[PDB]
Design an enzyme around this catalytic site. Sequence first.
Site, PDB file in Angstrom:
ATOM      1  N   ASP A  27       0.833  -1.203   0.000  1.00 49.89           N
ATOM      2  CA  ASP A  27       0.000   0.000   0.000  1.00 49.89           C
ATOM      3  C   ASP A  27       0.866   1.251   0.000  1.00 49.89           C
ATOM      4  O   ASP A  27       1.721   1.419   0.872  1.00 49.89           O
ATOM      5  CB  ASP A  27      -0.926   0.030   1.227  1.00 49.89           C
ATOM      6  CG  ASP A  27      -1.814  -1.196   1.337  1.00 49.89           C
ATOM      7  OD1 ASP A  27      -3.036  -1.035   1.548  1.00 49.89           O
ATOM      8  OD2 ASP A  27      -1.290  -2.322   1.240  1.00 49.89           O
TER       9      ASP A  27
ATOM     10  N   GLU B  82     -11.873  -0.017   3.499  1.00 50.23           N
ATOM     11  CA  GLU B  82     -10.503   0.394   3.749  1.00 50.23           C
ATOM     12  C   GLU B  82     -10.124   1.622   2.932  1.00 50.23           C
ATOM     13  O   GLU B  82     -10.840   2.048   2.025  1.00 50.23           O
ATOM     14  CB  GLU B  82      -9.552  -0.759   3.428  1.00 50.23           C
ATOM     15  CG  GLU B  82      -9.997  -2.089   4.012  1.00 50.23           C
ATOM     16  CD  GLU B  82      -8.924  -3.151   3.912  1.00 50.23           C
ATOM     17  OE1 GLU B  82      -8.684  -3.646   2.792  1.00 50.23           O
ATOM     18  OE2 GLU B  82      -8.304  -3.476   4.948  1.00 50.23           O
TER      19      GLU B  82
END
EC number: 2.4.1.10
Length: 438
Positions: free
Chosen positions: A53, A309
């Site tokens: 990420d 998320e």
Amino acid sequence: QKPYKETYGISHITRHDMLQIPEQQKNEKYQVPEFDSSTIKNISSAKGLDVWDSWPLQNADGTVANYHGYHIVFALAGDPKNADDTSIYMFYQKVGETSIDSWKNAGRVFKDSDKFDANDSILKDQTQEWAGSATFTSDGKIRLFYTDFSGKHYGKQTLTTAQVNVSASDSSLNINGVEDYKSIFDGDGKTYQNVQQFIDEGNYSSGDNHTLRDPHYVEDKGHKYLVFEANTGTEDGYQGEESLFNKAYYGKSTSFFRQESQKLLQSDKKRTAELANGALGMIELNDDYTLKKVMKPLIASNTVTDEIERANVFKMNGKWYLFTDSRGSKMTIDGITSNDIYMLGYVSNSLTGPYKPLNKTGLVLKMDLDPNDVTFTYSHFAVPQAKGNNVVITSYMTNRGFYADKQSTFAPSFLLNIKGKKTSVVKDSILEQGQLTV
Ligand SMILES: [Ca+2]
């Protein structure tokens, strides 16, 4: 158990909107492109790390910042075989280059000692560093926000900040250390679930999914905020068997509510629905980036999923857009499968609400997780641009099957067209791996 209707003044991802998605997602305008494996290289400067990420250093308005002539990308990195190595690294490239080889590596943001040197008791139990955001302040500082993960203390998740002190070297950037390293927020029980509620219900064995992570920094009207993934508390719409009878979570009609609710109550996802109370939350920060005010969630996802998320929000062409990534496997909507992964998206006239779904359902991106695919992209993130109607979509890319000399890397970025309440993947918009601006 009597049906009721209660919105708590916040927007909702309703089952009616989500039930439209299995048919809508078949359209190519909502589908993440497929990238052939032969076009992909490792981040060479990662020196064999798996890079996952990532998020760029942004100006307050969300656009990409220029630091000393460089773009900055923070990323989680480590190895798939050892999660507790997961750590934040600061990559950078000089403004004007797009090649993946132009990404340089300044190493880990934090020394192992930093959490101990910090005047902070929660930072002491941190075991992993999870995703967040970063902003280029008016003072010229690199202000980082991320998630403190504590594998020791039942998976507690804490919104954390730190200033990253950086020197320039004519050649490069170098991290000198961090300061103002502190916790900000870890849930209040009444607006956002906290780890204590998770512990008191039987921690992991309850089937609940306690989240409080991925803070995204955004300013508006001289207010600093963090939007983040969380779960609702006791005084919004909390989880439990009663939550399946709130009509606000279903939308449409009372007719539809009766039909859907009864089917849900006999579905084998019933329990998962009762525990599903994901939320995109919001808190105001003081000028010292400490907690100033806990505000009501921007949107919740009761009965739909517990896990929305990578909260993202920015003002663009006069409207506010709100995005979140979500896994189909964790949803309870008939027609949505474990092979599907999503970016959902909402729009509003003001940062603080109310939010309506883009493309009538909230569907913005769908990424397929079929096996015959060699590559996969994950953790999609919309990066607003200076001008135009297109945002850049970054993600990270993994490969099906192991190679000692291939790691998770920057995916080729592509463009998403945003106009009014409608979005559309721009066909032929494939950029370089990790490219941030177009
Ligand atoms: Ca929950």
